[PDB]
Swiss-Prot record:
<feature type="domain" description="PPIase FKBP-type">
    <location>
        <begin position="63"/>
        <end position="148"/>
    </location>
</feature>
<comment type="function">
    <text>Constitutively inactive PPiase, which becomes active when bound to calmodulin and calcium. Seems to act as a chaperone for BCL2, targets it to the mitochondria and modulates its phosphorylation state. The BCL2/FKBP8/calmodulin/calcium complex probably interferes with the binding of BCL2 to its targets. The active form of FKBP8 may therefore play a role in the regulation of apoptosis. Involved in the inhibition of viral infection by influenza A viruses (IAV).</text>
</comment>
<comment type="subunit">
    <text>Homomultimers or heteromultimers (Potential). Forms heterodimer with calmodulin. When activated by calmodulin and calcium, interacts with the BH4 domain of BCL2 and weakly with BCL2L1/BCLX isoform Bcl-X(L). Does not bind and inhibit calcineurin. Interacts with ZFYVE27; may negatively regulate ZFYVE27 phosphorylation.</text>
</comment>
<comment type="subunit">
    <text>(Microbial infection) Interacts with hepatitis C/HCV protein NS5A.</text>
</comment>
<feature type="binding site">
    <location>
        <position position="92"/>
    </location>
    <ligand>
        <name>Ca(2+)</name>
    </ligand>
</feature>
<feature type="binding site">
    <location>
        <position position="94"/>
    </location>
    <ligand>
        <name>Ca(2+)</name>
    </ligand>
</feature>
<protein>
    <recommendedName>
        <fullName>Peptidyl-prolyl cis-trans isomerase FKBP8</fullName>
    </recommendedName>
</protein>
Length: 157
């Protein structure tokens, strides 16, 4: 005996033969989850560690001006902007909020590819080189190469 019988009836009218088949799941190279860790758990802003800190890294604090290298691709793959070094005030929205958060989520020395909705990038804002289309999903690769402490002014409560 093979399998336990769980099939009742014969033909309810239709049958549907092997007519249209284009759903064949064959093993594809590069197993990527596609949907990574969403920074806000909102679905639009996700950070993927290419490398997550080679040495005994440290995550810069908001306030420290950190050097990021970003080269940003469009959701189709078109890299619209490249900048080998951008030093900005973390947490002070000195950048795109996607990045401003991704850095604290990044350890020093790592390179994270973040896909963030243009709304966290340059949706109705537009990017320096290309005015990035609104709510277009930006995929930016940021190298946190350096972090330096330069924030000791003011306070908030």
């Amino acid at each position: 005996m093979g399998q336990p019988p769980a099939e009742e009836a014969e033909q309810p009218g239709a049958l549907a033969r092997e007519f249209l088949a284009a759903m064949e799941p064959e093993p594809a190279p590069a197993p990527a989850p596609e949907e990574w860790l969403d920074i806000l758990g909102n679905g639009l802003l996700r950070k993927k560690t290419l490398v997550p800190g080679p040495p005994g890294s440290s995550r810069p604090v908001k306030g420290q001006v950190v050097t990021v290298h970003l080269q940003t691709s469009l959701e189709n793959g078109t890299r619209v902007q490249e900048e080998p070094e951008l030093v900005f005030t973390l947490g002070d929205c000195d950048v795109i909020q996607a990045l401003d958060l991704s850095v604290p989520l990044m350890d020093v020395g790592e390179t994270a590819m973040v896909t963030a909705d243009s709304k966290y990038c340059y949706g109705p804002q537009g990017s320096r080189s290309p005015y990035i289309p609104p709510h277009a999903a930006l995929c930016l690769e940021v190298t946190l190469k350096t972090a330096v402490d330069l924030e000791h002014h003011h306070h908030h409560h």
